[PDB]
Design a protein around this motif. Structure first.
Motif, PDB file in Angstrom:
ATOM      1  N   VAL A  80     -33.017 -33.043 -32.099  1.00 49.66           N
ATOM      2  CA  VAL A  80     -31.722 -33.241 -32.748  1.00 49.66           C
ATOM      3  C   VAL A  80     -31.969 -33.653 -34.197  1.00 49.66           C
ATOM      4  N   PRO A  81     -31.048 -33.381 -35.114  1.00 51.18           N
ATOM      5  CA  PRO A  81     -31.135 -34.012 -36.433  1.00 51.18           C
ATOM      6  C   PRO A  81     -31.119 -35.527 -36.315  1.00 51.18           C
ATOM      7  N   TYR A  98     -33.500 -29.231 -35.165  1.00 47.14           N
ATOM      8  CA  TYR A  98     -34.344 -29.758 -36.240  1.00 47.14           C
ATOM      9  C   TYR A  98     -35.648 -30.215 -35.601  1.00 47.14           C
ATOM     10  N   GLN A 153     -23.622 -30.648 -41.705  1.00 48.27           N
ATOM     11  CA  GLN A 153     -23.108 -31.047 -43.017  1.00 48.27           C
ATOM     12  C   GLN A 153     -22.011 -30.123 -43.550  1.00 48.27           C
ATOM     13  N   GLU A 154     -21.934 -28.880 -43.076  1.00 51.94           N
ATOM     14  CA  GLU A 154     -21.094 -27.855 -43.681  1.00 51.94           C
ATOM     15  C   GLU A 154     -19.993 -27.418 -42.723  1.00 51.94           C
ATOM     16  N   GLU A 161     -28.586 -17.049 -38.297  1.00 52.82           N
ATOM     17  CA  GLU A 161     -28.763 -16.758 -39.721  1.00 52.82           C
ATOM     18  C   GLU A 161     -29.272 -15.342 -39.949  1.00 52.82           C
ATOM     19  N   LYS A 189     -17.994 -24.846 -42.915  1.00 53.59           N
ATOM     20  CA  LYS A 189     -17.964 -23.389 -42.763  1.00 53.59           C
ATOM     21  C   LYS A 189     -19.200 -22.839 -42.055  1.00 53.59           C
ATOM     22  N   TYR A 191     -21.917 -36.671 -39.858  1.00 56.08           N
ATOM     23  CA  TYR A 191     -22.125 -36.675 -41.310  1.00 56.08           C
ATOM     24  C   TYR A 191     -20.865 -37.123 -42.042  1.00 56.08           C
ATOM     25  N   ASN A 217     -20.701 -40.732 -42.178  1.00 57.53           N
ATOM     26  CA  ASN A 217     -21.917 -41.374 -42.693  1.00 57.53           C
ATOM     27  C   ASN A 217     -22.555 -42.282 -41.635  1.00 57.53           C
ATOM     28  N   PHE A 218     -22.634 -41.769 -40.401  1.00 55.49           N
ATOM     29  CA  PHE A 218     -23.083 -42.560 -39.264  1.00 55.49           C
ATOM     30  C   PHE A 218     -24.478 -43.131 -39.493  1.00 55.49           C
TER      31      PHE A 218
END
Ligand SMILES: Cc1cc2nc3c(=O)[nH]c(=O)nc-3n(C[C@H](O)[C@H](O)[C@H](O)COP(=O)(O)OP(=O)(O)OC[C@H]3O[C@@H](n4cnc5c(N)ncnc54)[C@H](O)[C@@H]3O)c2cc1C
Ligand SMILES: Cc1cc2nc3c(=O)[nH]c(=O)nc-3n(C[C@H](O)[C@H](O)[C@H](O)COP(=O)(O)OP(=O)(O)OC[C@H]3O[C@@H](n4cnc5c(N)ncnc54)[C@H](O)[C@@H]3O)c2cc1C
Ligand SMILES: Cc1ccc(-c2cn3cccc(C)c3n2)cc1S(=O)(=O)N1CCNCC1
Ligand SMILES: Cc1ccc(-c2cn3cccc(C)c3n2)cc1S(=O)(=O)N1CCNCC1
Ligand SMILES: [Zn+2]
Ligand SMILES: [Zn+2]
Lengths: 229, 229
Positions: B108-109, B104, B12-13, B193, B15, B42, B45-46
């Motif tokens: 996969v997401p 996730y 989604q991001e 992270e 960066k 994303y 908007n798949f």
């Protein structure tokens, strides 16, 4: 005394084999006096994508969007999208959650993956610390009821698809166990499409008969040895 | 050379660490003279849900909906929804498909899961008898570039998560190999992270350097023994 069951159901066609397995679970658990709820994901047009739409209210960082951080914060602030909190309500009340779905690419259909992605957020389903055996859904049972295209013999250690338990690992251990569920043994209805009418009726009857004694079962030891050893 | 790469990107991001890994692959493959396409799921908007909206016109059998049959016949009859056929065009042209995604729930997401469910349809990616080594995408390479929350130590055979190869089995074997892909070794950037600045840039550099020689790599033996032995 007031056992509550949530069925999370992922199939497009109510006359399908999954539909019959779902209805039989509803019929049999309700006949037993259990309290039953069905999340019919396709009928709900359930939103599968993890996006910034899932948080209302002020973002902890609106310049760089971190889905896992923002939904954790939104959960504690009660600013998650309501479709998410509606599912969390059904889960929190449930004593047993049943997942009813056809295998899609060794996994759940994407609409059901989205339910997992978006409903099992931090604060609700797990915390740090507070995962695996200390997961926040500890005390609850979970059960995968999956139908497959391939036969049982194809899903053996030596068959081409590998053993059926290999594809349960991400769902039973990576997801449900991580969240603190105890996992009952999976219900796999192999290859209904090519099964004979007799065998299909048999597969349906075994599920119904197993549900009659579901509350007497013990969970599996959800370990690498159970899945792979 | 004159090689074509499709990157299927699910974050989604821009960066984000996944975003930098995607931008590095675009820059590096583009600098080498390769043809590069990116499916930013994303941003597009798949649609992840497998529904009867994936067939245009009218259905083979409108009274009982069977997603697998209807999309199979729709592919042969050139009546699939255009978002699916747009992706199939990019895949059909590609010599390599890179998937770039955060892990996730050991998978996969959901938005990327929906890509797999809907794009890799029967008659396009596989059929009878064309599957595994003889799947319809034979000749093509595929590569999973995945980031995790958990550290490399946790993803060992005896650690809490088990071997990272355990969760690659549904994706690498059940999906990519099944369709005829040869599967390149996964690119796993563990736990960016909690990693320091220095290790994060070292993980990005390992990826950028690996892309210099991507066409020299030999595929993995995509077997159960590679994954679990
Ligand atoms: C995208 C996608 C990915 C897939 N990936 C995989 C995979 O990785 N591995 C794999 O093995 N398979 C895979 N499949 C196949 C899929 O798992 C099976 O097609 C599905 O599990 C079959 O069950 P169903 O309910 O959809 O079938 P149905 O076709 O609905 O049921 C089959 C036969 O069911 C009969 N039936 C329904 N109810 C009853 C009843 N009460 N009594 C007797 N008969 C009844 C139906 O009428 C029919 O006779 C995939 C399919 C799709 C579409
Ligand atoms: C729903 C959900 C389910 C999940 N399930 C799992 C699971 O099953 N197992 C598991 O292990 N994890 C899981 N996770 C965690 C997830 O896999 C990680 O958070 C994700 O892989 C992290 O990558 P990212 O790109 O989002 O991180 P980012 O936060 O974007 O990157 C991390 C740090 O990256 C720095 N960065 C970005 N670019 C650069 C650069 N070029 N150079 C140096 N630093 C840079 C970012 O700015 C930041 O400082 C899950 C998360 C969610 C939300
Ligand atoms: C091992 C495996 C993996 C994937 C799928 C699969 C993916 N699909 C995507 C869209 C529609 C369908 C019907 C579909 N089937 C099937 C098997 S399988 O086990 O059922 N397989 C054995 C060999 N012959 C083909 C059937
Ligand atoms: C094994 C595992 C499974 C799932 C997730 C997971 C699920 N999530 C859902 C929403 C948001 C987040 C950040 C998230 N992480 C993490 C690990 S994990 O490997 O990162 N695990 C290591 C030990 N500490 C806890 C984290
Ligand atoms: Zn486990
Ligand atoms: Zn394989």
């Amino acid at each position: 005394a007031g056992k509550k069951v949530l069925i999370v159901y992922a199939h497009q066609e109510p006359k399908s084999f999954n539909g019959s397995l779902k209805n039989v679970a509803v019929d049999e658990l309700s006949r037993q006096g259990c309290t039953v709820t069905v999340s019919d994901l396709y009928a709900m047009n359930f939103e599968p994508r993890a996006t910034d739409k899932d948080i209302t209210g002020t973002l902890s960082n609106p310049e760089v969007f971190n889905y896992g951080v923002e939904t954790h914060e939104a959960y504690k602030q009660r600013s998650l999208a309501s479709d998410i909190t509606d599912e969390q309500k059904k889960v929190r009340e449930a004593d047993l959650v049943i997942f009813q779905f056809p295998l899609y690419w060794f996994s759940v259909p994407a609409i059901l993956k989205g339910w997992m992605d978006r409903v099992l957020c931090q604060g609700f389903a797990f915390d740090i610390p507070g995962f695996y055996d200390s997961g926040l859904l500890q005390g609850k049972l979970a059960l995968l009821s999956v139908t497959t295209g391939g036969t049982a013999e194809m899903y053996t250690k030596t068959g081409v698809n590998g053993d059926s338990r290999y594809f349960l690992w991400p769902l039973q251990h990576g997801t449900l166990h991580f969240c603190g569920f105890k996992v009952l043994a999976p219900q796999i209805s192999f290859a209904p499409e090519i099964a004979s009418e007799e065998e299909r009726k048999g597969m349906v009857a075994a599920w119904s008969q197993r549900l009659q004694t579901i509350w007497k079962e013990e969970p599996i030891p959800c370990t690498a040895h159970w899945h792979f050893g």
